[PDB]
Design a binder for this molecule. Sequence first.
Ligand SMILES: C[C@H](CS)C(=O)N1CCC[C@H]1C(=O)O
Ligand SMILES: [Yb+3]
Ligand SMILES: [Yb+3]
Ligand SMILES: [Yb+3]
Ligand SMILES: [Yb+3]
Ligand SMILES: [Yb+3]
Ligand SMILES: [Zn+2]
Length: 607
Amino acid sequence: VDTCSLASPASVCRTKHLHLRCSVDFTRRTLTGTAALTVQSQEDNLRSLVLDTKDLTIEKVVINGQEVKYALGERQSYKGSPMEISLPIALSKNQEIVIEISFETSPKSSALQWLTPEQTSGKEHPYLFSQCQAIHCRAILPCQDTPSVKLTYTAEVSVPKELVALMSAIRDGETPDPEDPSRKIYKFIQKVPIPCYLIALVVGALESRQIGPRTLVWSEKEQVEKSAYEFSETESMLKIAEDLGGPYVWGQYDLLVLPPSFPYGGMENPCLTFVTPTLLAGDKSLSNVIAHEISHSWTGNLVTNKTWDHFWLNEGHTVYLERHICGRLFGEKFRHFNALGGWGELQNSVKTFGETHPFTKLVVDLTDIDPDVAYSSVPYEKGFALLFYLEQLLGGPEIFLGFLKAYVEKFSYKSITTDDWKDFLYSYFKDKVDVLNQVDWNAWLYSPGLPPIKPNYDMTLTNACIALSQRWITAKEDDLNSFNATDLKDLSSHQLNEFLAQTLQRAPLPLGHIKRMQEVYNFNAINNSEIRFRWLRLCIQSKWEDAIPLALKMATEQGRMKFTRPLFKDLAAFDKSHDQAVRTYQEHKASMHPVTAMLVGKDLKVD
Ligand SMILES: C[C@H](CS)C(=O)N1CCC[C@H]1C(=O)O
Ligand SMILES: [Yb+3]
Ligand SMILES: [Yb+3]
Ligand SMILES: [Yb+3]
Ligand SMILES: [Yb+3]
Ligand SMILES: [Yb+3]
Ligand SMILES: [Zn+2]
């Protein structure tokens, strides 16, 4: 049961292909065009079917050259409106037909953000980008909006000629629009079957630079050079990921650096990963987000969650490969460092949600829950924690890596549940069932709170972080003079980050300690977004008013939800900044990403 979709389920019928012809109207902020769905019946005598839509205007539905009848049901809030279509002939099992739907999106589409020129880098051209995961594809085009169905797709997209269109597919040529010489048509082909959440579109003043044999980076002109250097490890990480997961099947692996309002670190669109510009630290230090996006080329994009209830499958395996890529690159001690970090993140979200909250369960029941509201680090880190525990139980990384690659090969091109995964684990490790039977499955998969067991972590790189954070916590006023810029000389950027994460977990500290920290370590100068984030949270939670313009500025100048949401919540929890926080949210709202706007609104209780 896909409880997030209102469409006919895969048991009734399945989309096999989408042919999208559309046009991006910046003046109206709509996409207008036709989606031709090739639909296969999975039942005898099939006479109608249902698709998901959200805020779509339907002009007509044509099958076999004639218009047919359809109806739109009433709005079911965030699930949108079900669209029922009457087929002009009854279909037998496995018969196919092509349904061509003429449609137009709302300017308020939850899939889309429309940017004026002044909201971009170059200031001369507007920009558009999509984010379909989880259930926003329906807010672009009628479809069975469920990751239980995989289709191939072709598209032709008409844009103003001075702009560039890209999708989650291979570029298949461009020509002038023959109906409007002020527009170009860009063509695309996705030959590998994908869930519709993986359909993506960007349109903007984009340039490309090549950075490895099957990778171009794309961004506006002003970001190209910085991005090319920042993501230069991409091919070596692709090679390591092929070694762990088997052949990369997607042809190209290009990267697109989005504007600052992009809501996530990354989105694994096939052929074209989207990333936040907040990765551009200048030293490649945030490149684990590229390792993660690459790993999704296997776990998520080849083997996919059957419904969003089983999202941990996508994210937990991807974090598990991500941390192996970083470990082959930087050493096993560093993999442990990141894993132990991941645990503290899990501790953080459990504490923020409460230890009985349903959203701290690994497998979540999303009946009547908007997946955007349920989204957190839990499936990433509780999922990773489960895999890391099994790895240790089952005889170490080399052994558990053979399972990962077999699992990927078993379920390639399929959509699967937690039970499918577990069955295969039991079958793969048949000779270790007795070990597998010591696992508290009910607790790990279905209980809220921290898992019932904590893995074993090497401490080598973490100890210096803990040691410095503990010095600061236990320091009294007469001890502040002992801290010095030399305390940091042997810490990597990752260790500075993790010193601040440890210290943040015991926030607030006295305001005098925080001011000293700034005096001796000058964290205010650091532009690494992860480090800056945690330091500003430390400052605001410790009630340093000087930090208020700095936190508001970071919260609004980018819109990665990982940063924007905790900053606004911290700023709203501080009496001194409460009113500016609400006011700035309100003045920025209209020009925020729509999912980000909604979430920060809920977080702040505004509207
Ligand atoms: C690296 C992943 C890609 S699925 C991501 O963007 N995350 C993971 C949880 C937070 C959020 C973020 O970094 O903004
Ligand atoms: Yb029949
Ligand atoms: Yb007509
Ligand atoms: Yb071609
Ligand atoms: Yb079994
Ligand atoms: Yb003392
Ligand atoms: Zn991911």
